[PDB]
Amino acid sequence: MIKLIVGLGNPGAEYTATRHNAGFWLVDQLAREAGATLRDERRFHGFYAKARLYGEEVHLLEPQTYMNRSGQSVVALAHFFKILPNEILVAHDELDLPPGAVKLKLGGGSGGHNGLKDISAHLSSQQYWRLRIGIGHPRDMIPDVANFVLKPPRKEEQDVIDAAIERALAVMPAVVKGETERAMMQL
Protein backbone atom coordinates (compact mmCIF):
# COMPACT_ATOMS: atom_id res chain seq x y z
CA MET A 1 0.00 0.00 0.00
CA ILE A 2 1.54 3.21 -1.25
CA LYS A 3 2.13 5.93 1.32
CA LEU A 4 4.24 8.36 -0.78
CA ILE A 5 3.84 9.42 -4.41
CA VAL A 6 6.80 11.38 -5.77
CA GLY A 7 6.79 13.27 -9.06
CA LEU A 8 10.17 14.04 -10.64
CA GLY A 9 11.29 17.20 -12.45
CA ASN A 10 13.39 20.34 -12.27
CA PRO A 11 12.43 23.54 -10.38
CA GLY A 12 11.49 26.83 -11.96
CA ALA A 13 9.28 28.27 -14.67
CA GLU A 14 11.71 27.47 -17.49
CA TYR A 15 11.48 23.71 -16.95
CA THR A 16 7.74 23.30 -16.36
CA ALA A 17 6.80 22.10 -19.90
CA THR A 18 9.91 19.95 -20.49
CA ARG A 19 9.75 16.16 -20.93
CA HIS A 20 11.88 15.66 -17.79
CA ASN A 21 8.98 17.17 -15.78
CA ALA A 22 6.44 14.49 -16.79
CA GLY A 23 6.31 13.25 -13.19
CA PHE A 24 5.43 16.70 -11.93
CA TRP A 25 2.55 16.78 -14.45
CA LEU A 26 1.12 13.62 -12.95
CA VAL A 27 1.47 14.73 -9.33
CA ASP A 28 0.12 18.23 -10.07
CA GLN A 29 -3.01 16.66 -11.61
CA LEU A 30 -3.32 14.10 -8.78
CA ALA A 31 -3.09 16.90 -6.18
CA ARG A 32 -5.78 18.92 -7.96
CA GLU A 33 -8.03 15.87 -8.23
CA ALA A 34 -7.56 15.17 -4.50
CA GLY A 35 -8.14 18.81 -3.42
CA ALA A 36 -4.62 18.92 -1.97
CA THR A 37 -2.41 22.01 -2.10
CA LEU A 38 1.31 21.51 -2.72
CA ARG A 39 3.36 23.80 -0.45
CA ASP A 40 7.07 24.44 -0.05
CA GLU A 41 8.30 22.32 2.88
CA ARG A 42 11.95 23.00 3.69
CA ARG A 43 12.17 19.78 5.71
CA PHE A 44 11.59 17.79 2.52
CA HIS A 45 13.42 20.05 0.03
CA GLY A 46 10.37 20.36 -2.16
CA PHE A 47 6.67 20.89 -2.63
CA TYR A 48 4.61 18.71 -0.33
CA ALA A 49 1.01 17.82 0.54
CA LYS A 50 -0.67 15.27 2.79
CA ALA A 51 -3.47 14.09 0.54
CA ARG A 52 -6.56 11.99 1.17
CA LEU A 53 -6.73 9.52 -1.73
CA TYR A 54 -9.49 6.92 -1.87
CA GLY A 55 -9.72 6.77 1.93
CA GLU A 56 -5.96 6.64 2.52
CA GLU A 57 -3.49 9.21 3.81
CA VAL A 58 -0.86 9.59 1.04
CA HIS A 59 2.05 12.02 0.99
CA LEU A 60 2.66 13.86 -2.28
CA LEU A 61 6.11 15.20 -3.12
CA GLU A 62 7.77 17.18 -5.92
CA PRO A 63 11.46 17.65 -5.08
CA GLN A 64 12.86 21.13 -5.77
CA THR A 65 16.45 19.95 -5.71
CA TYR A 66 17.08 19.69 -9.47
CA MET A 67 16.64 16.23 -10.98
CA ASN A 68 20.04 14.76 -10.01
CA ARG A 69 19.54 15.63 -6.32
CA SER A 70 15.96 14.28 -6.00
CA GLY A 71 17.12 11.63 -3.53
CA GLN A 72 17.87 14.25 -0.84
CA SER A 73 14.18 15.16 -0.94
CA VAL A 74 12.74 11.64 -1.03
CA VAL A 75 14.91 10.27 1.81
CA ALA A 76 14.18 13.27 4.06
CA LEU A 77 10.46 12.53 3.80
CA ALA A 78 10.78 8.73 3.89
CA HIS A 79 12.88 8.81 7.08
CA PHE A 80 10.64 11.39 8.72
CA PHE A 81 7.44 9.38 8.26
CA LYS A 82 9.15 5.93 8.35
CA ILE A 83 8.14 5.02 4.79
CA LEU A 84 9.75 1.97 3.16
CA PRO A 85 10.87 1.83 -0.46
CA ASN A 86 8.06 -0.70 -1.15
CA GLU A 87 5.56 1.96 0.01
CA ILE A 88 6.90 4.61 -2.44
CA LEU A 89 5.73 5.30 -6.00
CA VAL A 90 7.93 7.49 -8.22
CA ALA A 91 6.35 9.00 -11.36
CA HIS A 92 8.97 9.86 -14.01
CA ASP A 93 9.64 10.33 -17.70
CA GLU A 94 10.68 7.11 -19.45
CA LEU A 95 12.88 7.25 -22.57
CA ASP A 96 12.39 3.51 -23.20
CA LEU A 97 8.64 3.73 -23.73
CA PRO A 98 6.88 5.62 -26.50
CA PRO A 99 4.72 8.70 -25.96
CA GLY A 100 1.28 7.44 -24.93
CA ALA A 101 2.59 4.44 -22.98
CA VAL A 102 2.53 4.22 -19.19
CA LYS A 103 3.64 1.28 -17.02
CA LEU A 104 3.84 0.36 -13.35
CA LYS A 105 6.96 -1.50 -12.19
CA LEU A 106 8.74 -2.43 -8.94
CA GLY A 107 12.49 -1.80 -9.19
CA GLY A 108 14.30 -2.35 -12.49
CA GLY A 109 17.40 -0.11 -12.41
CA SER A 110 17.54 3.57 -13.33
CA GLY A 111 17.63 3.24 -17.12
CA GLY A 112 20.11 6.15 -17.10
CA HIS A 113 17.64 8.50 -15.39
CA ASN A 114 19.57 10.76 -13.00
CA GLY A 115 16.58 11.28 -10.67
CA LEU A 116 16.06 7.57 -10.20
CA LYS A 117 19.82 7.12 -9.74
CA ASP A 118 19.87 9.63 -6.89
CA ILE A 119 16.73 8.23 -5.19
CA SER A 120 18.09 4.68 -5.27
CA ALA A 121 21.39 5.96 -3.83
CA HIS A 122 19.80 7.89 -0.95
CA LEU A 123 17.32 5.09 -0.08
CA SER A 124 20.05 2.43 -0.40
CA SER A 125 17.45 0.52 -2.42
CA GLN A 126 16.03 0.34 -5.95
CA GLN A 127 12.91 -1.47 -4.60
CA TYR A 128 10.38 1.29 -4.94
CA TRP A 129 7.50 1.42 -7.45
CA ARG A 130 7.68 3.50 -10.60
CA LEU A 131 5.06 4.98 -12.85
CA ARG A 132 6.97 5.08 -16.11
CA ILE A 133 5.52 7.81 -18.39
CA GLY A 134 6.74 7.22 -21.96
CA ILE A 135 8.36 10.20 -23.73
CA GLY A 136 10.19 8.27 -26.45
CA HIS A 137 13.89 8.46 -27.27
CA PRO A 138 15.81 10.84 -29.56
CA ARG A 139 16.83 7.91 -31.85
CA ASP A 140 13.19 7.09 -32.64
CA MET A 141 12.66 9.85 -35.19
CA ILE A 142 15.95 9.37 -37.11
CA PRO A 143 15.96 7.30 -40.36
CA ASP A 144 21.93 13.52 -26.98
CA VAL A 145 19.42 12.44 -24.30
CA ALA A 146 20.38 15.25 -21.90
CA ASN A 147 19.08 17.94 -24.22
CA PHE A 148 16.11 15.85 -25.51
CA VAL A 149 14.51 15.71 -22.05
CA LEU A 150 14.98 19.49 -21.64
CA LYS A 151 12.56 20.19 -24.54
CA PRO A 152 8.79 19.92 -24.45
CA PRO A 153 7.13 16.99 -26.16
CA ARG A 154 6.02 17.61 -29.74
CA LYS A 155 2.29 18.52 -29.87
CA GLU A 156 1.22 15.06 -31.12
CA GLU A 157 3.32 13.48 -28.38
CA GLN A 158 1.84 15.73 -25.70
CA ASP A 159 -1.68 14.69 -26.67
CA VAL A 160 -0.96 10.97 -26.14
CA ILE A 161 1.18 11.57 -23.02
CA ASP A 162 -1.73 13.59 -21.48
CA ALA A 163 -4.07 10.65 -22.15
CA ALA A 164 -1.57 8.17 -20.65
CA ILE A 165 -1.31 10.33 -17.48
CA GLU A 166 -5.11 10.26 -17.24
CA ARG A 167 -5.04 6.45 -17.45
CA ALA A 168 -2.43 6.44 -14.66
CA LEU A 169 -4.55 8.74 -12.48
CA ALA A 170 -7.45 6.35 -13.01
CA VAL A 171 -5.43 3.39 -11.57
CA MET A 172 -4.39 5.24 -8.41
CA PRO A 173 -7.17 3.67 -6.32
CA ALA A 174 -5.68 0.22 -7.00
CA VAL A 175 -2.13 1.46 -6.38
CA VAL A 176 -2.92 3.07 -3.01
CA LYS A 177 -4.79 -0.06 -1.90
CA GLY A 178 -1.92 -2.37 -2.98
CA GLU A 179 -3.99 -4.00 -5.72
CA THR A 180 -0.99 -4.34 -8.08
CA GLU A 181 -2.41 -6.80 -10.59
CA ARG A 182 -5.56 -4.71 -10.97
CA ALA A 183 -3.49 -1.60 -11.57
CA MET A 184 -1.41 -3.33 -14.25
CA MET A 185 -4.41 -4.77 -16.07
CA GLN A 186 -6.08 -1.33 -16.09
CA LEU A 187 -2.85 0.32 -17.15
DSSP 8-class letter at 178: T
The closest of 80, 60, 83, 61 to 70, measured between CA atoms, is 61
| 128 labeled part of a ligand binding site | no
- State how far the Cα of 34 lies from the Cα of 19, in Å rounded to an integer: 24
- Residue 21 labelled as part of a binding site: no
To the query of whether residue 79 is one of the catalytic residues in this protein, the response is no
Report the distance separating Cα 60 and Cα 83, nearest Å.
Answer: 13
Give me the domains of the chain, ranges plus CATH numbers. Answer: 1-187 (3.40.50.1470)
Q: Which amino acid is at 166?
A: E
Find the catalytic residue in 20, 45, 92, 113.
20
Q: For residue 68, say whether it is annotated as part of any ligand binding site.
A: yes
Closest by CA position to 23, among listed 6, 38, 47, 3: 6
Contact (Cβ atoms closer than 8 angstroms) between residue 119 and residue 78? no
Q: At what angle do helices 155-176 and 22-34 cross, to 10 degrees?
A: 50
Nearest-CA neighbor of 8 among 95, 69, 86, 80? 69
